[PDB]
Amino acid sequence: GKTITDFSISRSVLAKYEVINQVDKKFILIRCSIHNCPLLVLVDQHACDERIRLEELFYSLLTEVVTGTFVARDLKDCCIEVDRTEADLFKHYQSEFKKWGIGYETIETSLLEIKTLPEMLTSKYNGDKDYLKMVLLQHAHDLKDFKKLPMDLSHFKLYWWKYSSCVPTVFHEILNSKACRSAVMFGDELTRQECIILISKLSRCHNPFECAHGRPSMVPIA
Amino acid sequence: ERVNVNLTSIKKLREKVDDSIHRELTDIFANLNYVGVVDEERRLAAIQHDLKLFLIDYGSVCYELFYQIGLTDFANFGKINLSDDIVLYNLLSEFDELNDDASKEKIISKIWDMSSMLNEYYSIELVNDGLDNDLKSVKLKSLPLLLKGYIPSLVKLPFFIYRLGKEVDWEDEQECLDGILREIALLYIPDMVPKVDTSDASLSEDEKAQFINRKEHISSLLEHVLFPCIKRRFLAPRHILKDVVEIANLPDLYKVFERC
Ligand SMILES: [Zn+2]
Ligand SMILES: [Zn+2]
Fold this sequence. Notes:
The complex is a heterodimer of chains A (222) and B (260). Chain A is an alpha+beta fold and 222 residues long.
C-alpha cells in the first residue's frame, strides 16, 4: 500500500498555520515546534476569497451535472449555419453537449438548431450567434483533439476536482470571473475574526496555493 | 508638586540614555502600525513602518521603555497598592540555592535597611508589623506605577526581591540607582509564554485552556496598552538595532500580486 510522500505534505502545511492579522489592507499575515521545510506567510486576501468562491461554484456546477439536475433554459429562433465537417463534429458530440445543458439538432451548408442552453451560457451569449458558434466549436475541437476528455457519468461523496478537467473552457471562464467579482478587494477592511474564517476555509480547499486564474495566493516572508 | 531631582548620579544616567538614542530607529517606532504577536516565548511582534514589515523583540523594547520611564519619573511615581498580602520571606521559597534561614534573612536585611530610600525615590513601600530586628514580618505595601492602565505580572516578583539584595551594588550611589531601575524594568516587562503542544492528547484540558488564555492576555496588553505607549514616547538606543529586523518590503510584494 505505497504512496508518494510529497503529496500529503502540501495539505498539512496550511493546517499548522495560526492568523496574526491583516497587513496593509491587502494581506493576511499567518504563522506556522517541528519546523522542517516550512514560519511567516503573507496571503493575498483577494486570491484567498476568490479561491474559496471558485471551489464552491465548481462544486455546485459538477453536483448538478453528475446528478442530472443542471438547468437547461429553452431557447427560440437560434439556428447556426455550419460546414459539412462542423455538422459531422456536432452530430458526433450531441450526447456530450446534452450533459452541459446544450441541446441541439443537426439539420441537412447545414444548420445547427439550438433548443436548450444552461443559464450561464444564455446570459453570456446575449443573442450573439457568432459568439455561441465559436464557444461550441472550441469545446468540440477540445474533445476531438484530446485536450478535454468526455464527462463520464457511469460512476455513482462527489469530488468535483476528479471531473474538473472535463469542464468546457467557457464554463471555467464564467466561474473564474464570477468568483473574482464576488471576492473581497485590495483596500477592504477585514477584522482578525474575518481573517481567521478566510484562512480556515482556504485550508479546506483542494488547491489553496493559487487564485482562480492560476496566480499564487501566498508568499513566505520568513 | 513634582519633586526636583538635583542628584549628579541621576543627571549622568540621563545623559547616558540621551547619547545612546538612534534617530532613524526612533522614527520606526514613532510612526508604527501594530500588526500582532509573532512568538510569545521569544517575545516577538510584527509592526508596519511606511511600506515595510518589521519583526520587533518587545521584551527588549519594553525593558528599555520601562528603564527610560523610571529615569524620567524618578522620585515622582504613583503607587500600586497590594486579604491576599505579599510576604518577602515566603517569596524566596522558589530558591533552593538559599538552603539556610539566615541566607534568606540576609536579603531582607539589605532591603529593609534601605526602606526609606526605596519608598521615597522609587515608591517601593516596605511595611513591618512585628519587631524592627524581626524580618519574617516584613511585607511589600506598594510598587511604582510607571504606566497608567498597566499592572505588572508578579510572576517575576520573587526574582525582583532576590536581585534587589544579591545583584544591586548598595556601596555606590550611581551603580545602586542604575541597578534598581534595571530591576524595576525587568519586573515590568511582559512575561514569556513557553510553547505548549496543543495537538498532543497526553495534556489536560486545563493546561491547553490556560495557555490559550495566557496568549490572549499578552495580545490584548501589547495592542491596547504597551504598543500605544511605545509609539507615543519610546526612544530607541543604538544597541537595540539587532532587536528590529526588516522581514518584508511591501512594494516588492505588490509586484507578486500586481494582476489577478
Ligand atoms: Zn481576481
Ligand atoms: Zn485571479
